[PDB]
Design an enzyme around this catalytic site. Structure first.
Site, PDB file in Angstrom:
ATOM      1  N   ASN A 246      -8.988   5.165   2.839  1.00 30.33           N
ATOM      2  CA  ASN A 246      -9.660   5.957   1.797  1.00 30.33           C
ATOM      3  C   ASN A 246     -10.608   6.993   2.429  1.00 30.33           C
ATOM      4  OD1 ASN A 246     -10.952   6.653  -0.657  1.00 30.33           O
ATOM      5  ND2 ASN A 246     -11.183   4.575  -1.379  1.00 30.33           N
TER       6      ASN A 246
ATOM      7  N   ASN B 176      -7.473   8.758  -5.888  1.00 32.24           N
ATOM      8  CA  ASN B 176      -8.227   7.755  -6.629  1.00 32.24           C
ATOM      9  C   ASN B 176      -9.075   8.352  -7.718  1.00 32.24           C
ATOM     10  OD1 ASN B 176      -8.852   6.669  -3.296  1.00 32.24           O
ATOM     11  ND2 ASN B 176      -7.423   5.711  -4.767  1.00 32.24           N
TER      12      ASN B 176
ATOM     13  N   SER C 276     -11.693  10.598  -4.212  1.00 31.28           N
ATOM     14  CA  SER C 276     -11.185  10.321  -2.890  1.00 31.28           C
ATOM     15  C   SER C 276      -9.654  10.213  -2.912  1.00 31.28           C
ATOM     16  CB  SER C 276     -11.807   9.047  -2.348  1.00 31.28           C
ATOM     17  OG  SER C 276     -11.371   7.884  -3.080  1.00 31.28           O
TER      18      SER C 276
ATOM     19  N   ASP D 212     -15.510  -4.774   9.048  1.00 32.35           N
ATOM     20  CA  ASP D 212     -16.721  -4.281   8.373  1.00 32.35           C
ATOM     21  C   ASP D 212     -17.420  -5.307   7.471  1.00 32.35           C
ATOM     22  OD1 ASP D 212     -18.331  -1.915   8.345  1.00 32.35           O
ATOM     23  OD2 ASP D 212     -17.781  -1.627   6.240  1.00 32.35           O
TER      24      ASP D 212
ATOM     25  N   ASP E 182      -6.334   8.130  -0.710  1.00 36.13           N
ATOM     26  CA  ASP E 182      -5.862   7.175   0.273  1.00 36.13           C
ATOM     27  C   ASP E 182      -4.707   7.781   1.073  1.00 36.13           C
ATOM     28  OD1 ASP E 182      -7.594   5.237  -0.853  1.00 36.13           O
ATOM     29  OD2 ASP E 182      -5.906   4.019  -1.575  1.00 36.13           O
TER      30      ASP E 182
ATOM     31  N   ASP F  31     -12.211   8.179  -8.276  1.00 35.63           N
ATOM     32  CA  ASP F  31     -13.494   8.725  -7.829  1.00 35.63           C
ATOM     33  C   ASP F  31     -13.362  10.039  -7.041  1.00 35.63           C
ATOM     34  OD1 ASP F  31     -12.561   7.908  -5.313  1.00 35.63           O
ATOM     35  OD2 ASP F  31     -14.291   6.669  -4.853  1.00 35.63           O
TER      36      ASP F  31
ATOM     37  N   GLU G 120       0.805  -1.198   0.000  1.00 34.18           N
ATOM     38  CA  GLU G 120       0.000   0.000   0.000  1.00 34.18           C
ATOM     39  C   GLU G 120       0.858   1.277   0.000  1.00 34.18           C
ATOM     40  OE1 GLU G 120      -3.006   0.322  -0.679  1.00 34.18           O
ATOM     41  OE2 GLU G 120      -3.991  -1.601  -0.145  1.00 34.18           O
TER      42      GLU G 120
HETATM   43 CU   LIG Z   1      -6.522   2.311  -2.171  1.00 35.81          CU
END
Ligand SMILES: [Cu+2]
Ligand SMILES: [Cl-]
Ligand SMILES: [Cl-]
Ligand SMILES: [Cl-]
Ligand SMILES: [Cl-]
Ligand SMILES: [Cl-]
Ligand SMILES: [Cl-]
Ligand SMILES: [Cu+2]
Ligand SMILES: [Cu+2]
Ligand SMILES: [Cu+2]
Length: 129
Positions: free
Chosen positions: A59, A46, A50, A101, A52, A48, A35
């Site tokens: 995110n 990202n 957003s 989650d 990270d 969209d 990551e």
């Molecule tokens: Cu990610």
């Protein structure tokens, strides 16, 4: 901060990630490697809109507030900048919520694609924890 592999393993274990939700320590170190390359300051935009953040690339679409992700939530109740600290506590606490989650570590696409099913114990080899 750029952690060493073993340094991060030790810190993750001190913060209770080892075997959290049944995921051994090597899974977490592997995820962080792919990551962020163990860099707590890593940020990545990202598609969209957003972003990270941090060692586990958490995110802003769900988990933290950065003020610029429309329609998003802040389920860890933290500013996304909190996830860039040298102190990994906020990233660990938030990761614990994410991995609980429903989909386990599949929430981290890089963990699914690069760590899942591999010999993750290699990530803690030779470490003084
Ligand atoms: Cu990610
Ligand atoms: Cl490494
Ligand atoms: Cl392991
Ligand atoms: Cl926002
Ligand atoms: Cl919004
Ligand atoms: Cl730390
Ligand atoms: Cl220990
Ligand atoms: Cu433990
Ligand atoms: Cu958000
Ligand atoms: Cu220790």
């Amino acid at each position: 901060k750029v952690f060493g592999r073993c340094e991060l393993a030790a810190a993750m274990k001190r913060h209770g990630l080892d075997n959290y939700r049944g995921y051994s320590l090597g899974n977490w170190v592997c995820a962080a490697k792919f990551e962020s390359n163990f860099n707590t300051q890593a940020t990545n935009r990202n598609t969209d809109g957003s972003t990270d953040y941090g060692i586990l690339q958490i995110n802003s679409r769900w988990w933290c507030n950065d003020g610029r992700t429309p329609g998003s939530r802040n389920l860890c109740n933290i500013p996304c900048s909190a996830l860039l600290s040298s102190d990994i506590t906020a990233s660990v606490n938030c990761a614990k919520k994410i991995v609980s989650d429903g989909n386990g570590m599949n929430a981290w696409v890089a963990w699914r694609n690069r760590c899942k099913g591999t010999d993750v114990q290699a990530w803690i080899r030779g470490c003084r924890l």
